[PDB]
């Protein structure tokens, strides 16, 4: 358990190096989100590892495949018992679902089930490409709203789409947010829009004593 | 690491050790294995190497959507791996899917084949609707395919019902994986016949007594 809304990415490509740095900060302070570069290099192996460290981990994989398997691949983080897991809302609802309901049997030890919507990167370009007539903006709400239908815990969501998804969605929709830096909202501003879980990359990561860093983003954040 | 079938056996157990039984059944030269999101969950590359290294192809099956540069790093480390095949989302955009090919480039012809998802087989009009995609399974998935093709990846994951007509449009360097192939829902036979590239099989071989006949077999009846 922490109060801090503060995930960290940790987008290493060697092991030590990253408990190195995590090392060099607290689990009261803030979580870790291990996504694809460190697990294609690394699996389940490394997570247990920032696990036994007892950190909470955002395995952030966003499954997205056939309900079966996408179901089977959630059950597997529970089991390796990460913290929060995503999958991605184009997958569609019976994905969603059978992703959603694999959690069922973890009970009050399931992990938090997020949903990707539309990508931070894709623009409007992208999605023509795929022949998809709605803005980002638009789609990903769909998307956001498809998630809730589904009963997923949240969405990952643009700081530029934050305040209209809380405003939409309420409050027990968490709303993952990345691309914060104290000094693209800042810690602060993310506070007030309402996001719950505020992914920061680098500006902790290439601090030099980055627990200084942690410390004044939520010191920061107390008010 | 080759093989001549055109056989791709599915991993999907929940315990490893029972994974490599079946594994010490049969042999690198009768198929391929691929590894899907449920195995590599629970045992990670660690295990893609306990295969490869009993000589055994992968086709490494995660189908990466994620932002470009990080499919990007995926997909390179897919490849670090030393897996044969690995894929990709087509609706990650042709962006993502060009990181992915660059990405490879380093590696020469030492490369995997990347492969791009289309339209995933299990996804019915009705799926789309909520997406609000307004052309069927089928439309979309070929619109995928030449994006995937314009991108230039080695070809598509696509189901035995677009096999044909893809081989038609995209030609035959344009590899054609497909599942839902069953001996006696295309047939080995059948799905050669389509011009599918390779056939991935699941529990017709791992939930068969004596597999490696049945693999055996599958390879004798495209002895054709």
């Not at 690394?42 to 247990?48: C, I, S």
């Not at 089977?72 to 679902?97: F, K, Y």
């Not at 409050?171 to 501003?189: A, D, H, N, S, Y």
């Amino acid at each position: 358990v922490t109060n801090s809304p503060v995930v960290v990415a940790l987008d290493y490509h060697n092991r030590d190096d990253a408990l190195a740095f995590v090392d060099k900060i607290d689990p009261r302070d803030c979580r870790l989100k291990v996504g694809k570069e460190m697990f294609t290099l690394f699996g389940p192996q490394f997570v247990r590892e920032l696990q036994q460290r007892g950190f909470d981990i955002f395995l952030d994989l966003k499954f997205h495949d056939i309900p079966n398997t996408a179901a089977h691949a959630v059950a597997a983080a529970a089991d390796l018992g990460v913290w929060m897991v995503n999958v991605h809302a184009s997958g569609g609802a019976r994905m969603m679902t059978a992703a959603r309901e694999a959690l069922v049997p973890f009970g009050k030890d399931a992990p938090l089930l997020i949903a990707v919507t539309v990508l931070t990167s894709m623009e409007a370009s992208d999605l023509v490409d795929l022949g998809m007539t709605l803005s980002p903006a638009d789609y990903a709400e769909r998307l956001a709203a498809l998630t809730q239908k589904c009963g997923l815990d949240g969405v990952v969501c643009s700081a530029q789409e934050a305040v209209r998804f809380k405003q939409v969605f309420g409050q027990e929709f968490k709303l993952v947010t990345p691309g914060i830096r104290p000094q693209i909202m800042t810690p602060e501003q993310a506070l007030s829009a309402g996001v719950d879980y505020m992914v920061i990359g680098r500006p902790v990561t290439q601090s030099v004593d980055p627990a200084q860093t942690l410390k004044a983003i939520n010191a920061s954040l107390q008010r």
